[model samples]
Target: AECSVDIQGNDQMQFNTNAITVDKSCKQFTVNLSHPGNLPKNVMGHNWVLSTAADMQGVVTDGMASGLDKDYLKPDDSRVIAHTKLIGSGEKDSVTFDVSKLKEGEQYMFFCTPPGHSALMKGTLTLK
Candidate 1:
């Protein structure tokens, strides 16, 4: 089974794909993010954040409040299953987590935590 997925973030505040699936056979999973644009983190910043669908808003809200120094994520927040460091143009980062953390029937979501970015930089994650 595939154990990793690569995603792209751009100057447009968009992710190249809106959906992803993690194979049950995977013991661990990785999410890789890249930016092909010219903007900096504060302007077109993006990171890959994971959480249950229900916890998305809460994570994002707190991340926004946390600001860029924290990579727009609350430090050691349990709500976040995993996340990549915030990155900008021509930059990249990745995160890996145990597949056991995922539940079969639960809904998972991935997004960028910067303000207003999730509106377009979000997607569904499934396990099967």
Candidate 2:
């Protein structure tokens, strides 16, 4: 099957889903993220960032220092596989990535790098 998925982030600093699956047969995969809350980007903004589960901490750490203007992500950070720009209150963004970049046994995860939001807004991605 083709690989595509949708997710939502809210003012509560949460994502609507905690898991995502990537089909192995897909040449590319897409993630569409929406924020349905009524807060400003500087307050309750959200973004979907994909990286290895092991790299999550480092990515968030550096991303925090990068600040919101940089979309809370490090510049040209090789650790990030894919990501969306920060959005808030009715805004949306999407990202498409090559499926071949993922390995079978390796684990992946998605999270919002909006400062401290990652504590509650994070999830896993699996390839099958």
Candidate 3:
């Protein structure tokens, strides 16, 4: 099996799952994000953003200045571990990161940075 995870976003401004586990056998892990809300990007866009749990809010706060074209992320922000581009219904994106970036006993999080959407679109990501 591949070292990958799948997540879905909807027009309801929510993600289907709220947790992730990265297997230790792989040197890299991939995140596949899909938007099946059947809406336009502006109406219902979603992306995957991963960072330290402590840095999650800061990233989201700082990303507000980034427009939709920037994927709602601060340009070249080092706090971001990995991210996928925004997409709408029928569209999908993925990000692959080196597993070494993750550590045992550390907290990590994944969230969608759409304006006012993280309340229900955020989740915990763990490595084992």
Candidate 4:
């Protein structure tokens, strides 16, 4: 139960949760993403991307030009520890990754890589 989390995005550009904790005992962790808005993916897409807090900027920066087709994410970005497929309007997606990749007490962040969405769609993720 503690190994999975569900979060949502809306047309107003917001995320349902600002934080998530992964259990140390979990061998893997999963993130479920939902978008219940009316907007089309081209206009307002939301994706869940995980990376170190310090790497967030770089990841997003390089991803900017990749465009929506690339899920607004840099193709094969090494810094991204985990990420969900970009979704929009009544759509859903999920991603799972090995829990061992997360270090205890490390500062990690999950955010939407859609152009201009990261400013408001970010959250903290921790290993507990």
Compared to the true structure, candidate 3 yields what TM-score? 0.96
Highest TM-score against the true fold, candidate:
4
Residue 49 lDDT (model 4): 95
Candidate 2 deviant stretches above 4 angstroms: none
User: What are the runs in model 3 whose C-alpha is more than 4 Å off?
Assistant: none
Q: In candidate 2, residue 87 scores what lDDT?
A: 91
Please list the Cα RMSD from the true structure of every candidate, rounded to 1 decimal place. Answer: 1.0, 1.0, 1.0, 0.7
Question: What tens-digit string does per-residue lDDT give for candidate 3 at 49-76?
Answer: 9999999998998776687888789999
Task: State the lDDT at 85 in candidate 1.
Answer: 95
Q: 15-124 in candidate 1: lDDT tens per residue?
A: 99999999988999998889998999888889999999999999999998898899999898999999999999999898999999999999999999998887778999
Report the lDDT tens digits of candidate 2 across residue range 16-128.
99999888888999999998979988888899999999999999999988987998999999999999898988998999999999998889999988788888999999999
**Lowest summed lDDT over 10 consecutive residues: which window, candidate 3?**
62-71
Please provide, for model 4 over 1-128, each residue's C-alpha lDDT reduced to its tens digit, 9 standing for 90 to 100.
77899999999999999999889899999998899879998999889999999999999998767898898889999999998988889999999999999899799999888888888999999988
- Which candidate number maximizes lDDT? 1
Clashing residue pairs in candidate 1 are none
By TM-score, highest first, what's the ranking? 4, 1, 2, 3
In model 4, the clashing pairs are: none
User: Which rank order by lDDT, best down to worst?
Assistant: 1, 4, 2, 3
| Cα-based lDDT for every prediction | 0.92, 0.90, 0.89, 0.91
